[PDB]
Curated annotation (Swiss-Prot):
Name this protein carries in UniProt: Neutrophil gelatinase-associated lipocalin
Similarity annotation: Belongs to the calycin superfamily. Lipocalin family.
Gene expressing this chain: LCN2
Positions bound to enterobactin: 106, 134
Major site of localization recorded for this protein: secreted
Organ and tissue specificity: Detected in neutrophils (at protein level). Expressed in bone marrow and in tissues that are prone to exposure to microorganism. High expression is found in bone marrow as well as in uterus, prostate, salivary gland, stomach, appendix, colon, trachea and lung. Expressed in the medullary tubules of the kidney. Not found in the small intestine or peripheral blood leukocytes.
GO biological-process terms attached to the record: acute-phase response; cellular response to amyloid-beta; cellular response to hydrogen peroxide; cellular response to hypoxia; cellular response to increased oxygen levels; cellular response to interleukin-1; cellular response to interleukin-6; cellular response to lipopolysaccharide
One cellular-component annotation, GO: specific granule lumen
Function: Iron-trafficking protein involved in multiple processes such as apoptosis, innate immunity and renal development. Binds iron through association with 2,3-dihydroxybenzoic acid (2,3-DHBA), a siderophore that shares structural similarities with bacterial enterobactin, and delivers or removes iron from the cell, depending on the context. Iron-bound form (holo-24p3) is internalized following binding to the SLC22A17 (24p3R) receptor, leading to release of iron and subsequent increase of intracellular iron concentration.
Amino acid sequence: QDSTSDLIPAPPLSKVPLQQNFQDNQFHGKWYQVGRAGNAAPREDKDLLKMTAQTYELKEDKSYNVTAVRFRKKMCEYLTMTFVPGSQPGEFTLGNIKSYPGLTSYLVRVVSTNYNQHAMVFFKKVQQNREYFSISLLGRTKELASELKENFIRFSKSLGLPENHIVFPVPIDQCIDGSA
Ligand SMILES: [Y+3]
């Protein structure tokens, strides 16, 4: 007993650049997820199209405590995960993976960034032995130059993803900034 799935395969990592000479101190702080792409099934619930935000807090041990917030079903929802430096600067694994049920593999790779406007970051993970990947386009503001968005689309297609697996969330006020 169980289940079936059909997923676009994760690309070979030779298709996924790594930011040269990654600077963890320059990367820390608040980012908006201005574009999202991945092999997971796109979801209908229109409320999910709202932009979310993340905070990368660099710790003394060089790990980040990463907090995301989204405005969902009238609530601010918060999720904090720990990113441990991986094999190469700009890569990370997941701290305390035993406490994520059904999650057996997790990898983060920063593809490119100029640290004070934008970033693209690649994620790959195995959740109930299905392989997912995603890419995020991060902005220091909630809006990004069109060319950055066009670059993000082309890079996502190059990894085998079609347009319908690529989205630009709608900016919002609730939760991701907070209060006047
Ligand atoms: Y996410």
